[PDB]
mmCIF file of C-alpha atoms in Angstrom:
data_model
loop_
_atom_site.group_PDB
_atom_site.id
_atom_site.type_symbol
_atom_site.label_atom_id
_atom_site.label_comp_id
_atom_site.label_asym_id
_atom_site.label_seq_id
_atom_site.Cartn_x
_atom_site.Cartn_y
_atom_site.Cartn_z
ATOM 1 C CA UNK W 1074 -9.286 17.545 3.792
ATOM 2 C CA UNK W 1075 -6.318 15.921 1.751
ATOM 3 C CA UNK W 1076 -5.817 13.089 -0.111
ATOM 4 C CA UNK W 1077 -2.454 11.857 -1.416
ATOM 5 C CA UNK W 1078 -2.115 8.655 -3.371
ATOM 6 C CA UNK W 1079 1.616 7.616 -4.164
ATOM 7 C CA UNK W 1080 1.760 4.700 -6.837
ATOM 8 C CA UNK W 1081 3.982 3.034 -9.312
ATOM 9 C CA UNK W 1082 1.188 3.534 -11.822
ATOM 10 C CA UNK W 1083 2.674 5.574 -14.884
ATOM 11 C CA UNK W 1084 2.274 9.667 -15.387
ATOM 12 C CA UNK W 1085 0.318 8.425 -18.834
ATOM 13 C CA UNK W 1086 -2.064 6.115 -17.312
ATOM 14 C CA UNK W 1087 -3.673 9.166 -14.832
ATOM 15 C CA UNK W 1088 -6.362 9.923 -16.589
ATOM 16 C CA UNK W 1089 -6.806 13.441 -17.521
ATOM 17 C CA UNK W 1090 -9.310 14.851 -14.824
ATOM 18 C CA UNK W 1091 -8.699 12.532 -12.065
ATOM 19 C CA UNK W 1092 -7.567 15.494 -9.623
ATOM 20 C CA UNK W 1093 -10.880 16.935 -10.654
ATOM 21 C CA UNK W 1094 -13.224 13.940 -10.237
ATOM 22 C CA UNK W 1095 -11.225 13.114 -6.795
ATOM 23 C CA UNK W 1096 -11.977 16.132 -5.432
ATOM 24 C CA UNK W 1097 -15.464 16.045 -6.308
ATOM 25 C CA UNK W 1098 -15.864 12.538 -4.587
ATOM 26 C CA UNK W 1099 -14.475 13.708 -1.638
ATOM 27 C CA UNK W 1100 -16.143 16.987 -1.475
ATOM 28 C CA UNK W 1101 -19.650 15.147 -1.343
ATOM 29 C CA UNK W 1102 -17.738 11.739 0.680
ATOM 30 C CA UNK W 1103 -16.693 14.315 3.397
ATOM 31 C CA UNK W 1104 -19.659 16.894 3.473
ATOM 32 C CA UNK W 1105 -16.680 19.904 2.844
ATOM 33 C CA UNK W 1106 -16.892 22.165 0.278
ATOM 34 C CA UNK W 1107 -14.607 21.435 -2.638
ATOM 35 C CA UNK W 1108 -12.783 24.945 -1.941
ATOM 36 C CA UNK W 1109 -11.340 23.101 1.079
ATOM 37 C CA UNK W 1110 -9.874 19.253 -0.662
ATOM 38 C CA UNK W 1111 -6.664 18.992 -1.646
ATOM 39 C CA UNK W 1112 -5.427 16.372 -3.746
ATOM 40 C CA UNK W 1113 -2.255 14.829 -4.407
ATOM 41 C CA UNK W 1114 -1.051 12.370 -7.428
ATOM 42 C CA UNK W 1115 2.730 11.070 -7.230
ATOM 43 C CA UNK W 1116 2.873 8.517 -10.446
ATOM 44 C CA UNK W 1117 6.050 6.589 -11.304
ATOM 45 C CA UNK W 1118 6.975 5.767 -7.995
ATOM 46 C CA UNK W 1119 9.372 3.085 -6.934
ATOM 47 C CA UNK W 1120 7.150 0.769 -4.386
ATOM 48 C CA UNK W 1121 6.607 -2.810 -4.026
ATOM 49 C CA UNK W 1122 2.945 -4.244 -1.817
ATOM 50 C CA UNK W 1123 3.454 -7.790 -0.878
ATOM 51 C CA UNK W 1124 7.261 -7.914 -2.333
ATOM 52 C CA UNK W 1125 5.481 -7.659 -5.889
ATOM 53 C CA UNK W 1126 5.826 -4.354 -8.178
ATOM 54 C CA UNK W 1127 2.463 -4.690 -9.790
ATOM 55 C CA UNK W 1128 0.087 -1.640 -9.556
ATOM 56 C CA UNK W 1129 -0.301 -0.388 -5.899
ATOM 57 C CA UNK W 1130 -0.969 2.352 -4.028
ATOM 58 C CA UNK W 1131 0.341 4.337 -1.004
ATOM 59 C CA UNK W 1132 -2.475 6.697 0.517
ATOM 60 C CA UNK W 1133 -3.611 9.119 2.854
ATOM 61 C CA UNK W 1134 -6.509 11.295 3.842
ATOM 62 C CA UNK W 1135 -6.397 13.616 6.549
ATOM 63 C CA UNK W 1136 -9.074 15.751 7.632
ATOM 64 C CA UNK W 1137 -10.100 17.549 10.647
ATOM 65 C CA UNK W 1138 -13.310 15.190 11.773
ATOM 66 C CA UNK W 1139 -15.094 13.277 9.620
ATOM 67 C CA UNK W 1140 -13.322 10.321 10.188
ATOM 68 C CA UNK W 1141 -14.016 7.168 12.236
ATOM 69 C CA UNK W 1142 -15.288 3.385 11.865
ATOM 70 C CA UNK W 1143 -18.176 3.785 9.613
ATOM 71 C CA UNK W 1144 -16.797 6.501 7.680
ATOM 72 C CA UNK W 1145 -13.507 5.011 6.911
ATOM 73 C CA UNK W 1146 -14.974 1.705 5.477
ATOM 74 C CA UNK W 1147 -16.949 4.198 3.063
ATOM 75 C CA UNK W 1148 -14.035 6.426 2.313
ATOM 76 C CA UNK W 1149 -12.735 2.699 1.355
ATOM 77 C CA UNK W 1150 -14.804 1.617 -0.992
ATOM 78 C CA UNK W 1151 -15.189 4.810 -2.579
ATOM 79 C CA UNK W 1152 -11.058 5.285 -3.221
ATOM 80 C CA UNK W 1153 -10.502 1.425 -3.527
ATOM 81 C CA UNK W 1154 -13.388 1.973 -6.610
ATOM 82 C CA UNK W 1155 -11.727 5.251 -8.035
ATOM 83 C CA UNK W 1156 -8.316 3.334 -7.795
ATOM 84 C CA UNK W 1157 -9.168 0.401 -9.554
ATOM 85 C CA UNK W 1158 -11.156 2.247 -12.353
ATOM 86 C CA UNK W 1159 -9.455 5.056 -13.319
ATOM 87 C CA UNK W 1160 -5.727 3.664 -12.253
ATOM 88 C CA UNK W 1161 -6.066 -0.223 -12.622
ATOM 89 C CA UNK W 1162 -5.145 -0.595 -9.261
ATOM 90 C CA UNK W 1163 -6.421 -3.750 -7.422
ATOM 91 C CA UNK W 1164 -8.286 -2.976 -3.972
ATOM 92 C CA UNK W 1165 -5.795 -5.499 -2.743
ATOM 93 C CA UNK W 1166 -2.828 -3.555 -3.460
ATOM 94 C CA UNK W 1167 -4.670 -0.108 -2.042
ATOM 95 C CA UNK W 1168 -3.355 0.966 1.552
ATOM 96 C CA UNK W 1169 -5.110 4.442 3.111
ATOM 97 C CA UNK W 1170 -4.132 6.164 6.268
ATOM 98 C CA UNK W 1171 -6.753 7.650 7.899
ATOM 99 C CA UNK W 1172 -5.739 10.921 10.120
ATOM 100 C CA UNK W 1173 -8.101 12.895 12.238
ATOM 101 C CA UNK W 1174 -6.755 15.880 12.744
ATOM 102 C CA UNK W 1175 -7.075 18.466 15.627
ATOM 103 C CA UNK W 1176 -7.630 21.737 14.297
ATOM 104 C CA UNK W 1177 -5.151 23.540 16.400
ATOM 105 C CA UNK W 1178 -2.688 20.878 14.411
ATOM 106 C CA UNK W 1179 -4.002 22.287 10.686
ATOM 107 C CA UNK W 1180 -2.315 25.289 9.202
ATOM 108 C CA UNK W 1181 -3.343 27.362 7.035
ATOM 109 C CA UNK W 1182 -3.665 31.156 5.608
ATOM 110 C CA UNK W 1183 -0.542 32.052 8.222
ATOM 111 C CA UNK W 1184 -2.823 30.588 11.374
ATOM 112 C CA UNK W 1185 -4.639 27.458 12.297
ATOM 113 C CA UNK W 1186 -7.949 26.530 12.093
ATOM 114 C CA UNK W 1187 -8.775 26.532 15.691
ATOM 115 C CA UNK B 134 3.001 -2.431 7.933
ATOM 116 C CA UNK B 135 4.181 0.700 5.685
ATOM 117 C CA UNK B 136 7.933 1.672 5.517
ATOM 118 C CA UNK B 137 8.479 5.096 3.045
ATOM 119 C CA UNK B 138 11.999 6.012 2.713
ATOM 120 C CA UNK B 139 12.955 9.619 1.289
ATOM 121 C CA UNK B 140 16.648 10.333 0.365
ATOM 122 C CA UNK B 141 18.825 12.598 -1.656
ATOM 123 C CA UNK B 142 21.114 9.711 -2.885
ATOM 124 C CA UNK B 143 20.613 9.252 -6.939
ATOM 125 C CA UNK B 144 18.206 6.471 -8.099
ATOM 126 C CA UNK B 145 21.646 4.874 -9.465
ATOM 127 C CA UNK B 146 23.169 4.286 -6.068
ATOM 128 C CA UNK B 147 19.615 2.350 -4.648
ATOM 129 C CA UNK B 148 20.604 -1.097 -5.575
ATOM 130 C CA UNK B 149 18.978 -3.709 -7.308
ATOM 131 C CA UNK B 150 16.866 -5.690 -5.089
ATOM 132 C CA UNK B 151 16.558 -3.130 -2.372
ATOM 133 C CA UNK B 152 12.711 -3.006 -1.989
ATOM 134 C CA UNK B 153 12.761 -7.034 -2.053
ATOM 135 C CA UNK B 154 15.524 -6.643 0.994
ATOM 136 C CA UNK B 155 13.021 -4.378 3.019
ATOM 137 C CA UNK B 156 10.156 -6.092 2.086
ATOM 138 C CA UNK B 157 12.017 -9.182 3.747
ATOM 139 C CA UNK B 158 13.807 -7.320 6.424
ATOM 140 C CA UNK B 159 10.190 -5.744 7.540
ATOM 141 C CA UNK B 160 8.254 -8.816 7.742
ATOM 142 C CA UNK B 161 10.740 -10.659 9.897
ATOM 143 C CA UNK B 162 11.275 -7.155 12.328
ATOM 144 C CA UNK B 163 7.646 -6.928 12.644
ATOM 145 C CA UNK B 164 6.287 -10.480 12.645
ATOM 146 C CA UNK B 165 3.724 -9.461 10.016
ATOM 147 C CA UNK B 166 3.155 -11.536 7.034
ATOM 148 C CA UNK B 167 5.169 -10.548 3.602
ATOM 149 C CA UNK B 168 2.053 -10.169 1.908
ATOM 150 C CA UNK B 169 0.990 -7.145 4.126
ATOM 151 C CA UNK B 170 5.008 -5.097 3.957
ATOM 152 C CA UNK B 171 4.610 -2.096 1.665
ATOM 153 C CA UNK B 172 7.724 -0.312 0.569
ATOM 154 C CA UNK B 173 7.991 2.708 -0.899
ATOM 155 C CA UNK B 174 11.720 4.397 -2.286
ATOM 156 C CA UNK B 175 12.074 8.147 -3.347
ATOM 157 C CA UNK B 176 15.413 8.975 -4.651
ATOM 158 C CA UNK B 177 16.660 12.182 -5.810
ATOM 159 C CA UNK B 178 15.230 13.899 -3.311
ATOM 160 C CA UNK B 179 15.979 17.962 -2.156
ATOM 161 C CA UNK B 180 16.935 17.885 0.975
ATOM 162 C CA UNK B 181 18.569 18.758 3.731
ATOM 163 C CA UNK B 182 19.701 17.430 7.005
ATOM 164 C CA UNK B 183 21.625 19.481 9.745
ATOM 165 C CA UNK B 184 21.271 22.234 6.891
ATOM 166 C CA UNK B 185 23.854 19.654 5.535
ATOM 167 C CA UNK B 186 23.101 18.316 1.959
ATOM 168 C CA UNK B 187 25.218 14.767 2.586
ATOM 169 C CA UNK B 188 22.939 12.055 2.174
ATOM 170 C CA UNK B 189 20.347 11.447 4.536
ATOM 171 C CA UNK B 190 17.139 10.170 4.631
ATOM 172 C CA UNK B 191 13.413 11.228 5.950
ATOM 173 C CA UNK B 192 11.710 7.803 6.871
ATOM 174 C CA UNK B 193 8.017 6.662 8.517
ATOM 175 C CA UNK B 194 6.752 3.077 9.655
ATOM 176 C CA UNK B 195 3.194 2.797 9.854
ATOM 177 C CA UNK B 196 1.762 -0.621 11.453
ATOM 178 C CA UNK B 197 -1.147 -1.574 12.768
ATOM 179 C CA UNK B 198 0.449 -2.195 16.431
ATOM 180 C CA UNK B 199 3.920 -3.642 16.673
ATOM 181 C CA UNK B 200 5.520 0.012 17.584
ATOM 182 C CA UNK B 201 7.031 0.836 20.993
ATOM 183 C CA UNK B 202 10.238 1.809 22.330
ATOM 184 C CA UNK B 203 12.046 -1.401 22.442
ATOM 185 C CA UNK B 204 10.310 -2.388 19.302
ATOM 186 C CA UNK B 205 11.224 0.992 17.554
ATOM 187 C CA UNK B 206 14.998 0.314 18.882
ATOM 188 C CA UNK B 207 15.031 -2.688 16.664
ATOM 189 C CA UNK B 208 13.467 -0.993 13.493
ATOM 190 C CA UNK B 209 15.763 2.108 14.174
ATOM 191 C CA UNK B 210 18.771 -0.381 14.694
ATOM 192 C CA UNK B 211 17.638 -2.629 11.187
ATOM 193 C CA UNK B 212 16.542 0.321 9.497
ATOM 194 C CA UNK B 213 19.723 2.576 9.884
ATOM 195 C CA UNK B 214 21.583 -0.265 8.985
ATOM 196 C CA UNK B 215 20.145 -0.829 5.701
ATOM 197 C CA UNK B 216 20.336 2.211 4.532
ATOM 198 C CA UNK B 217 24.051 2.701 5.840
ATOM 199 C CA UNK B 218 25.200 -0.528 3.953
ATOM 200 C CA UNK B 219 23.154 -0.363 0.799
ATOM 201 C CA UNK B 220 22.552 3.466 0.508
ATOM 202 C CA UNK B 221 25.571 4.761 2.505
ATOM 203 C CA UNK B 222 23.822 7.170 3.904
ATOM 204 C CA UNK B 223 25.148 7.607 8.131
ATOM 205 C CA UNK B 224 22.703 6.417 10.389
ATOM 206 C CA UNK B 225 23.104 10.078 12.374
ATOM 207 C CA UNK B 226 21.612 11.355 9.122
ATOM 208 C CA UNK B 227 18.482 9.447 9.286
ATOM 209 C CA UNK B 228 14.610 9.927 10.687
ATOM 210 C CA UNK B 229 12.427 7.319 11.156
ATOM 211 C CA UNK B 230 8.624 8.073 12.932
ATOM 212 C CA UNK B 231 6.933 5.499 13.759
ATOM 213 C CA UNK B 232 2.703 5.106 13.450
ATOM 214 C CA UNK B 233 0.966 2.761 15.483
ATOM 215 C CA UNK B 234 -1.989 2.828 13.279
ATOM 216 C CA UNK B 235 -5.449 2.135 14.685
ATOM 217 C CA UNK B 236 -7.098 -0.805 12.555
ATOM 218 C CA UNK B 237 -10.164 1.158 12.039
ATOM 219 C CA UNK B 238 -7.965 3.927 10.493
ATOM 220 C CA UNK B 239 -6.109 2.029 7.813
ATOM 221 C CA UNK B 240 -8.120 1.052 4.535
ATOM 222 C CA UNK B 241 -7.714 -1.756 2.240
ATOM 223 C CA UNK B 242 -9.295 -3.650 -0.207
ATOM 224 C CA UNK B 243 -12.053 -1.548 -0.294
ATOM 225 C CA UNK B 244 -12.705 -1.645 3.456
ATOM 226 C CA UNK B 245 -10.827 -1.034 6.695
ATOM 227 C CA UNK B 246 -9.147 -3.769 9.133
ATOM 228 C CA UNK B 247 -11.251 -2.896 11.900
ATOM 229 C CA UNK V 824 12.441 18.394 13.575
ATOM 230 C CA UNK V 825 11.514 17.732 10.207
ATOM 231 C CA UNK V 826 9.737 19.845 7.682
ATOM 232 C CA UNK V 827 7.842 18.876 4.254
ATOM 233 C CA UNK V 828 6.438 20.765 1.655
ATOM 234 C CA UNK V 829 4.999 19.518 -1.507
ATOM 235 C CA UNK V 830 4.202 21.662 -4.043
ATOM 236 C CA UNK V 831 3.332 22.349 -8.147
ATOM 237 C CA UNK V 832 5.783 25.285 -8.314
ATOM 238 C CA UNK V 833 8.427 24.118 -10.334
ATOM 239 C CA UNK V 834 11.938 22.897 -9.698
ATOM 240 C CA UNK V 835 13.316 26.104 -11.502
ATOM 241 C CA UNK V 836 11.206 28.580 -9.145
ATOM 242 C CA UNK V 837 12.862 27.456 -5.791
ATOM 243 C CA UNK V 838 15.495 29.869 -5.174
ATOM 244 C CA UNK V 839 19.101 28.487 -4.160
ATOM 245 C CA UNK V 840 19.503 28.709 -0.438
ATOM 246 C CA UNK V 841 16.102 27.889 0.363
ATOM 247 C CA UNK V 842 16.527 24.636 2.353
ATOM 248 C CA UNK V 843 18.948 26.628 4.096
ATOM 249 C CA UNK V 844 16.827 29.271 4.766
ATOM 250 C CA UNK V 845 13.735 26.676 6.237
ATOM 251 C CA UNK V 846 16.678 24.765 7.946
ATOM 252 C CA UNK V 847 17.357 28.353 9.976
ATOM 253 C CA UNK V 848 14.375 29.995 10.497
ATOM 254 C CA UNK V 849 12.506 26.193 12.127
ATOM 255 C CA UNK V 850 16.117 26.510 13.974
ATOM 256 C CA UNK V 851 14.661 29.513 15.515
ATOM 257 C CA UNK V 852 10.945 28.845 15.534
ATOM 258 C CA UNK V 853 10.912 26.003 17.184
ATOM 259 C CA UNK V 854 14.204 26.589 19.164
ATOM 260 C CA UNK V 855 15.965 23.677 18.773
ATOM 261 C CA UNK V 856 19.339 23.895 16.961
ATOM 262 C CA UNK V 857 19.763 23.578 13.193
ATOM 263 C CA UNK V 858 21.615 20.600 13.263
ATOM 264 C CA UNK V 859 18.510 19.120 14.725
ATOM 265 C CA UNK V 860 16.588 19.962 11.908
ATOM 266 C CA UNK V 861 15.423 18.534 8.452
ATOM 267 C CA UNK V 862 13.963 19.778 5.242
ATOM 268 C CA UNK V 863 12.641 18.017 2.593
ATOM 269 C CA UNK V 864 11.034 20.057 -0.664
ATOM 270 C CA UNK V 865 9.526 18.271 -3.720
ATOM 271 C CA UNK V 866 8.539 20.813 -6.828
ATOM 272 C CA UNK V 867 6.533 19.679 -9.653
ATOM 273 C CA UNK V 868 3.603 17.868 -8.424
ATOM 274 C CA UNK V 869 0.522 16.741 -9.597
ATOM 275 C CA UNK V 870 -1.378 18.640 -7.405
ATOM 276 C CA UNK V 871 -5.090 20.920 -6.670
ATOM 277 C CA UNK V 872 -5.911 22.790 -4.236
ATOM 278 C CA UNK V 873 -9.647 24.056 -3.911
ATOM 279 C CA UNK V 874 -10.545 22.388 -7.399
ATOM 280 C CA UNK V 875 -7.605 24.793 -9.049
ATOM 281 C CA UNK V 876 -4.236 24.035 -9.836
ATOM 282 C CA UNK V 877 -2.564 27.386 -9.300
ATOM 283 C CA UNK V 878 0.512 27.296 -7.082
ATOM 284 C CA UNK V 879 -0.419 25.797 -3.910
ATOM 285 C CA UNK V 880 1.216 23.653 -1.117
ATOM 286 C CA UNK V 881 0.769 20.525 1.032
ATOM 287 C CA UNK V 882 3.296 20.419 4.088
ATOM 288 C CA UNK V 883 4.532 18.777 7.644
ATOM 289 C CA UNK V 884 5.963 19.428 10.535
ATOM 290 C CA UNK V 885 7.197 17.008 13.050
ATOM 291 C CA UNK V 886 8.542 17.668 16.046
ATOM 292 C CA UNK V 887 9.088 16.305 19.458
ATOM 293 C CA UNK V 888 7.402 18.472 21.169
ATOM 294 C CA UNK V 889 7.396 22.111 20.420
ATOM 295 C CA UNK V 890 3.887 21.553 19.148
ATOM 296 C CA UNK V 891 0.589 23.501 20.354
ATOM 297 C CA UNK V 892 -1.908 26.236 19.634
ATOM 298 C CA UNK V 893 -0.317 28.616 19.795
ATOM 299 C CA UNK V 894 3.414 27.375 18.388
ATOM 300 C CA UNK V 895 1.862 26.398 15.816
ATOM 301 C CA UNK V 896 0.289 29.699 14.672
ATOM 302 C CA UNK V 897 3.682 31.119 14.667
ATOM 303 C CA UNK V 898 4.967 27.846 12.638
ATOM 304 C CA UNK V 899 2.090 28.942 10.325
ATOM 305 C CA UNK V 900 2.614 32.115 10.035
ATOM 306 C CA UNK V 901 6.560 31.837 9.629
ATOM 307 C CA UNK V 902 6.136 29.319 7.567
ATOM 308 C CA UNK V 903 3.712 30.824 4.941
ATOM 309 C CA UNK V 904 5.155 33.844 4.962
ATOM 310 C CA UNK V 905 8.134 31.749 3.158
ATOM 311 C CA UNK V 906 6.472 29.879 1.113
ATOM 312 C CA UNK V 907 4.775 33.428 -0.044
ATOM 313 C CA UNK V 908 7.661 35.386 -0.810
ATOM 314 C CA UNK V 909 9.832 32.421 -2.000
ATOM 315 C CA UNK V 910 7.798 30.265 -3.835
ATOM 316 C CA UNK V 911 5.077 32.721 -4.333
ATOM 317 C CA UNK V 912 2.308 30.315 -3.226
ATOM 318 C CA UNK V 913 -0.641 31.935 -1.547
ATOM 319 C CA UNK V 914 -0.920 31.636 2.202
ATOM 320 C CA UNK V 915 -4.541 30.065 1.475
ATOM 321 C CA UNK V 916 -3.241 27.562 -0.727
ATOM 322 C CA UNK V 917 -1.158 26.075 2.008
ATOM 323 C CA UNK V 918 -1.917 23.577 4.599
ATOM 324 C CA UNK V 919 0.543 22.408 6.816
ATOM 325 C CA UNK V 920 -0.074 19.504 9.170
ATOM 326 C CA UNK V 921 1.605 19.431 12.629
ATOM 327 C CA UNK V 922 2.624 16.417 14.455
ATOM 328 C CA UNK V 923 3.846 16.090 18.015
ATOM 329 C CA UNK V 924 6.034 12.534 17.937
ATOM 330 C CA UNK V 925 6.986 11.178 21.424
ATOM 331 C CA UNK V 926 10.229 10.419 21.557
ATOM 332 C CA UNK V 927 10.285 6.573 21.745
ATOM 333 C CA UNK V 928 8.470 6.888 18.145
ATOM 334 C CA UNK V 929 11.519 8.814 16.155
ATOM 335 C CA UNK V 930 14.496 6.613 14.983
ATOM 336 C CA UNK V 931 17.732 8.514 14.752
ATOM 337 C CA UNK V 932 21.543 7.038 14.965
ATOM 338 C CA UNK V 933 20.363 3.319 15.198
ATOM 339 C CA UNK V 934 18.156 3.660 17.823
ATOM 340 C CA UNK V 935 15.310 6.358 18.961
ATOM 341 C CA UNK V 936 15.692 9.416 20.758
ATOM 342 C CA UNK V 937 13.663 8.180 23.792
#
């Protein structure tokens, strides 16, 4: 799986470890190993939510299965709650783009994963 | 709805007020409430279109239904001309794809819309 | 078509000519000329990969059509074969994800391609 979260948040207020601690959450949030999450931090970016440049967030998680109805509202809660604690970022302000992926659509190691 | 727009043109040359103008310029294309229109600007960008380095831009939409063709026509058609009058950058150097998101797949405030 | 990747490598480790050099060989990968095609690289990210932060990298490839099994192991294996010898980024530190847009969902020139 990956997770990217774009936000206007500053470089300074990413806590040190937050790479780390995301993909721990979404090692155990997923079921995957760790040795298979990627994650993504792009601070300092120029975004507005609403028309208003207070602290938001841009984000994504693919991941071939795993995702769906159920497990999307807890993928939600999970990143709205890392968001807001670690980055300040209201739950309000928090979009996520959910992707399942087909495998045959995943590269990797010079092949796919089908 | 989510509108991401990546471009090699300098942060100096993106106006003031820009992300205000497609905040505006979304909500009335789309028919979704202000409130809901994320924008997201990334200047300064390496890249390349036509294996041309002239300014262009790589672009995505995301919205939870309100994509089709004649709808995408009319973003396309908007879009391009934003970013030709503000940016300068020629509408034959510009991508746009389009997401019609699946409520269930699109997370906010710690839940989903589904 | 239009390619991504994201990457920690830094700005100062991506040789000159390599947008050129992704711009040609997708040209001939995915058979569609070079002025057709777009390339987009952003060095220095916050990013992990597996729980590490050695050089690793998080791409896309979108492309009307053009996209399947077995296209996209060759995309794969074209693709981190550069990223290996250019960027020096392990081919299992690199996933790539591959999108098939239809037509009437990719705004070009004002309008879509559809």
């Amino acid at each position: 799986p990956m997770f990217i979260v774009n936000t206007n948040v500053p470089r300074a207020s990413v806590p040190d470890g937050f790479l780390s601690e995301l993909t721990q959450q979404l090692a155990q949030a997923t079921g995957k190993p760790p040795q298979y999450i990627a994650v993504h931090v792009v601070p300092d970016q120029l975004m507005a939510f609403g028309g208003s440049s207070e602290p938001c967030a841009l984000c994504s998680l693919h991941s071939i299965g795993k995702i769906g109805g159920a497990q999307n509202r807890s993928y939600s809660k999970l990143l709205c709650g890392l968001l807001a604690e670690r980055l300040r970022i209201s739950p309000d302000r928090v979009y996520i783009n959910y992707y399942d992926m087909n495998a045959a659509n995943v590269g990797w190691n010079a092949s796919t994963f089908a």
